Nucleic acid binder design. Sequence first.
RNA 1: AGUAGAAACAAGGGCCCUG
Lengths: 712, 545, 51, 97, 552, 50
Amino acid sequence: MEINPYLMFLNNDVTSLISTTYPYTGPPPMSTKYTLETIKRTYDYSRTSVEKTSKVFNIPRRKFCNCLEDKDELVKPTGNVDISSLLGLAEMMEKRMGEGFFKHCVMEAETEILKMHFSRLTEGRQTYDWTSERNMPAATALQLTVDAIKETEGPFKGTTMLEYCNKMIEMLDWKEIKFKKVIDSIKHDEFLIRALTINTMAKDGERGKLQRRAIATPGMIVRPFSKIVETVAQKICEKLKESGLPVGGNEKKAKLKTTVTSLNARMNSDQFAVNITGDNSKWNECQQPEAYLALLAYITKDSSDLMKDLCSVAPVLFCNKFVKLGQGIRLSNKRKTKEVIIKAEKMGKYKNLMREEYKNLFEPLEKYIQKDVCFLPGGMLMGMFNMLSTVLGVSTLCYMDEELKAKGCFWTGLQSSDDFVLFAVASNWSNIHWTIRRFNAVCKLIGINMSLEKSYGSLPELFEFTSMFFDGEFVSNLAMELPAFTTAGVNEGVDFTAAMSIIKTNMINNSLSPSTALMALRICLQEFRATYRVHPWDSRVKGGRMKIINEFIKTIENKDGLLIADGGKLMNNISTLHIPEEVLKFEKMDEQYRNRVFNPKNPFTNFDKENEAVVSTHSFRTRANRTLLNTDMRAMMAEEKRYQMVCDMFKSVFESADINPPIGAMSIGEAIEEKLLERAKMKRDIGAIEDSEYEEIKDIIRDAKKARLESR
Amino acid sequence: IFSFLATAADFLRKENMFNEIFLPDNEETIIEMKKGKTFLELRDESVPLPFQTYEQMKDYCEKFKGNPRELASKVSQMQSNIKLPIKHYEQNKFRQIRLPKGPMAPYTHKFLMEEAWMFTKISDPERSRAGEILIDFFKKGNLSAIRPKDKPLQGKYPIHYKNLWNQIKAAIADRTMVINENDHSEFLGGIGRASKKIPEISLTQDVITTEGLKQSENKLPEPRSFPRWFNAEWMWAIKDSDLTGWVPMAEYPPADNELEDYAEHLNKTMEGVLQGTNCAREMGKCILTVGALMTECRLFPGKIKVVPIYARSKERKSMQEGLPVPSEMDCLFGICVKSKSHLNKDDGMYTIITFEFSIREPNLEKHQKYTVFEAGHTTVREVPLYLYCRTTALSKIKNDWLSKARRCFITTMDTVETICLRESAKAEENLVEKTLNEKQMWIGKKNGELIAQPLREALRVQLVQQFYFCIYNDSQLEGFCNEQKKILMALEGDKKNKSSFGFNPEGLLEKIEECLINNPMCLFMAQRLNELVIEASKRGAKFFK
Amino acid sequence: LQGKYPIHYKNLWNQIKAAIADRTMVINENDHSEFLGGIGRASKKIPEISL
Amino acid sequence: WSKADSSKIYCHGIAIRVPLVVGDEHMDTSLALLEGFSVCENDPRAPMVTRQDLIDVGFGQKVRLFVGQGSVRTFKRTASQRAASSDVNKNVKKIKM
Amino acid sequence: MSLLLTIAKEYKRLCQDAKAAQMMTVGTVSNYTTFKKWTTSRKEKNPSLRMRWAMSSKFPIIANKRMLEEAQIPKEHNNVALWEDTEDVSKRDHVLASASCINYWNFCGPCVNNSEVIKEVYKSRFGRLERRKEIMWKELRFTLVDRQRRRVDTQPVEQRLRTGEIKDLQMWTLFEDEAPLASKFILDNYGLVKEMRSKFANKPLNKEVVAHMLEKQFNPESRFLPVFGAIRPERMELIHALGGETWIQEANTAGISNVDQRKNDIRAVCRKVCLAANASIMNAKSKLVEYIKSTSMRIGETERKLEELILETDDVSPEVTLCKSALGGQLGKTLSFGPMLLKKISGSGVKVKDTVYIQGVRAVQFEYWSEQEEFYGEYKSATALFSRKERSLEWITIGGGINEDRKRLLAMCMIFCRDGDYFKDAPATITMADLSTKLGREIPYQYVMMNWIQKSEDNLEALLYSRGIVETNPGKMGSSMGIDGSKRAIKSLRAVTIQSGKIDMPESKEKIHLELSDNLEAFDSSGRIVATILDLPSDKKVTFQDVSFQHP
Amino acid sequence: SKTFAEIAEAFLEPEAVRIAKEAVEEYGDHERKIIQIGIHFQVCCMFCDE
RNA sequence: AGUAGAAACAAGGGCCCUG
């Protein structure tokens, strides 16, 4: 016999089995060629040849905005924009939402941008340092930038975001910058290019669209302005119903269902509806920051004169951005015994010993190129601006005209980033087609293209949106979250409760069935027992932990109160997923074991900080890597160790430093001194202290104060 | 006053607003972005074309008024120079998929499944580690009874394999699962075949002319043909294995309400049905062998080791008659060997070697990479013996994901419970056992006719599908399974008389057929999808023959 | 100190005080009493003919 | 009344909030004294003390003290029962004329 | 003690340096927070992988050293290692160890005197457990469920607070020496603090953990979830084990957590005081504010001020709304038209004037909105989604489960939109007396027709007849509503759609600061009315327990 | 949050909030100055003290 | 040799260490 599983798709639906296709049960798969092709496609998509010359860098600057040419194969992507249409659509959207809308949003944003501390830039994905020219986390990059500022002119007394932005601005006009290293200094032009510089990362953690195989990583001189723009964009998007970017899960489902009901209720008897599943292409390669600049200027027209200047920064910076070529080419001989490695800055030299493809792709991009960088004056990148593009897109679904009503035609829908859903209505197919072509045209006028292969249509109730297929019912893919049914990798106490919580959320939202949840529970339990090299007592397994387990087990009288990490069995089920085991066994443990576990004096316990879990000896912290031990990355550890000593001493004095953020007009030394004297008196009055000890402490403290104030 | 001011100051300091901004003096009442010189020079340079200074753009945007007529005119103009095609599938049907042409796709999985032969023994709880069982099986003499010959049926470098097998036997005899670095192992382990570096600072035009150092010409994979051995494996992995308990599983907790009782009952049925198959023993084999290999790679790098390919199971349960309380069993399918898994970084590669036992002669098309030897005879009566040998590699990522191969159970349970609950709700009655024993599901074709069997027996097909997805996972299969959904949605539209349409299906077919290369699973599923659309054309439109 | 369903008893005591305050010994809501009266026996019933 | 809530007095069901100026045997912290203290102009002559000796001061006296973190002030054991609600509402209504 | 002297010596040594001195001298203390981030920064992509790759090692854990020496923790107990003298690179005061040592500690390690304090630390979760234990399960059945999505609370919590009120409470219960100035919330809530302090005093504990647990103990976890049946936190915490899309585990959970009683009592008190202040004619505003501040109530054991509870709850009722408005309390954008509930989804408009003749010729001004708008509506066990257009009810859809509720919702919707001829020519039955001004306070024709409907069912039937009636076309038979509220008929009303399955309640995390008039009618930056005193029951007598009306 | 007025309402009386709001609207200055003015105003009030 | 993909590994740092 010959086998074919797809045959089940005849006598059964398709949504209730679509999960079977997703191969998320196996390992997923993992430069310069990609980047060069991307640069090429970006230039190419702009359908023009006009260029200017930057008096700053003296470089050709292709201008792609309101300069459309080469109107052939328009079905293909285009990155040219007509600002007039953009502003018209924005005006129509405002008219729909009412007056005083954009102003209200920018006001809500300014209400936060001002009070924000400049330390919230540490949170986020990696960034590109502008001194070592590598991708470090944000905290270290901020530290290094501050230290450089201080070593150049003086310490940064600022405590908010605005002062940091003004300092950055000023630093774009200096003439000599210093910074630490195994203490090199640089000039204005080099620092400028190195600041506008941008790097790439091949993380693409999520599978999602395999086309996504990279992501951007700007510097530190572009983060706050980007945050400002994203904040205003968020405050705008949240007000709209035709957007689903910030929300997640049930929200967009409810949106779609209400939209469908409204649609079915509006259309008369002589009308019929249609759906479409769209997947835009080259999203991050057609969106232009110049249109964003004009749009933000149109928005910040009635608000204060302050927001007008801030929002206008990140656009021009992305309009004058540089890209980073990574790792260069690799050379080799025939037998491949030897192998030479080369970097980007050198490819301009050995451009003859490369494949003809690289030559055809590289020589054209030799004028836009500088040392290991290319001057991309436009385009965009992944993750940089998602919400703003979503706003720009939603402006289309709001369109309306006299022709659409002369035929009784109108469209609506719902759009997220590069993924939308359309609902067209008309009285005949000849008009449906015309409506769809009109929509495509209006989207083409603002660089929003559409993929003709990944996009398809059908009658109303059949579509998909972000891996969620929709019909009369709602099909939870249930494979999108399969990896979550795994031990996080934090500690023993936690992973089990976290897994149970995830299972509960699935059962609530994703309609996960009971028996499936039980199976997942048992599987996660087995994986937990296997990872930490632990097994039950009744088992016969041998090894390190199990040895002492079987040794001291005799002291116990009720194993039902034991923990899994200490040779305990499972006591939990569906009706007990919202209850950690530690709580479920507390009433049966042995006082000895109970007290030896829940003791605050543990050489292991560390706090992590959601953290819906119990604390005990099992809540440990893992060892730290040591590969850096050999690398000479030690000079940087010095300042970190200094800050750590300072912080831990301050905390030794003030125990609530972490819980309640400190505040006041005193410095650190003043508060420390005063508190120490206070405690000394408080004790010597009643507690076990002598006048000699008090006087010695006081002398030491005054001497330390003198030294502190004398050093500088 | 002082009290009020103190409270207010504390609040502000808590809100970070205790600064000149919110509490300025008379003079410092004008806060503004310190617009420098360079920033302005750029801003006046990034303006769109018609404007040349940010001031003009600001004046045009702050006063922009809507003129719907010119907008509609440009819309129509752009709508005429485009000519967007619209294609209802009913008129423009989908052609069949064009698979590549060439030789057949051979076996790729590291371990053998159908052709595998194993030696079994009884398990003692004391001796449970691998380094122990590999000796226990060694004492009885069968593992040592083997003695291949220098004449291979097929393959290459047989001398290296033979010497490696002899060294393995010697090491086992020494009670030390270790091997020395000789020329043979060095050749099979890729010890010194890592490229040598040559800086450019030390390079001249003269150095390049001596030995050509051109840019490496990447040799992308080559195409293949449809494999004819896949259906055999699929049909073999559906039958029992004479034992069960191949895949370890945890215990069932207590129950208090009907819900947990139902869940436990259904889970027990499914687990008992699945644990008896052959795919299950392969899953357990992979689990345990990969665990052992990962442990070794973590503890004993820079050292060639010896790890067995084994599994644990339990003989089936007959009636109370005869010997009750059936025993357990340790099974051994072959030997495995690693080579200096210095996993400095994820995605790395550590070459392993596989010595497996079989009793079935090979095929050149399928067992192309293997190098078989004629060993001797073994009992059951006596039968000849073969020794399949090859080389491959692994990574941290693959090891981890293969060890977590119990997800197929979850997916299958989800699908089945969904079907049963959906059928039970439409009637408001417990219809689960009936749905498992009665509801029929298409499986395949035989003699040009369709075949069906209850879901209770079709679960195995979905399980094997998931297992293979876990095994043959790659970028090719990813793209395929991502691009096939459109076809299924079009099919559904055809079933419900929904007049579907599209813009460019040919491009979709092209994209699909682009990622079909030398990966058996993609080819098999594509041929089966073609057969699906064909069989449905007898009942639906939108498909060409 | 030692008991089984303390919350029911406590809420019922509060309801008792409330009722007495209202000068009527009656208790309108029937959630706790129903429970504590049905703990002995409470279930559905299927006709033999539907078997 | 009850030792649990030592800041209330129940008369005929009605409740009465007793100020927190002095602490008897039951009250066992500075919490019962805070409504007797208030802030005043800083005086470096007055002494600096703890939160426990704070009970041994005389009504109408001044004393320096440390509060929370990085902050020192001067307090006086004299209260001010008035609030801001009325002092603002009244003065406002006197402006709409 | 000697430790104090050691800390002083360390401070001196640290000040001897120059950089440490500069940083401890410049700026304020807040900089500490910043310094807390530049240090100890290291993450990992797939911690699961690295955890299986590390636990496969010999000593993957770190631990303190002196704590082990003092605890007499040996090494190589029974030929199995536990740790070896070394120094981690980050801490520099910790030593590598293995997981087995933890078991050693748990089995033959130092024991504390008592540990029942845990039950107080995690009281919320022990409460979950107990609430579970006091349940009486029931049979299981299979069927389809009408699961509506909405924002609700999943954590039962008493005395729900804000964050500013919680941050001080933690400090005053654990770190009193480091306490700030006394805030009003403390001086008011003294007994509460005393209670929370009596338990966590003179105990060996890690305090950060306690603070986190208290935050959880005072946080109602608000979620947007699908829901079926009654709405109570006691259920939502385990909703996962009560029913899904296809199954239901029946169970009675009515007699637990005594929550909604507090809310209904609060709303009753609000209604009472609102009526009281309405008795006035020129100062009902100040009268109401005085009645508020002159009142308190008991919660469990403690006595709380009314104005304090009102600003913490989220009961969207036409009574609570008024109070929260008088006290300047911000609130959500939720409407109220009589008993029904409403929420605007989109659209706009502006007021407009019109008149109607009551009997013969008696001109009476009534306003409406001149634009298209869309509204969600929720009455008892019934939902609706409709649109108004220039004094007309354009369309409406319903997903309820009752005929009576359906009809009442439809009628109140028609009224809210001034749709029909009655608003063009009122009926003879109404007169100038029923018009308005019980004692001078006018009444718009809207609420007039409202009470006219609530009076007799036949007024409601006539009002429904005011809506167009036609013959049920084929196919739409299922999506049709008769006069009785039947899912199908031969002749049904005009522009109506029915369906099985409630409507998904919208959501918006917005807040607005509104005001009100001397007649107790709130406005929201527009001529729209969100609440009044005509949308609540007329009056009723109730005996409030544990309350203090300290006002003449 | 979401506006300086709501913030000022946290520790100030809404009356002075509205007052300072109308004032800044009169002078048409940046509404971030609602706070200072309210404080000054409230001080004046608590100065008069009947 | 081999892996896998549209580039990387087939140890790396100073005789010693390390994931």
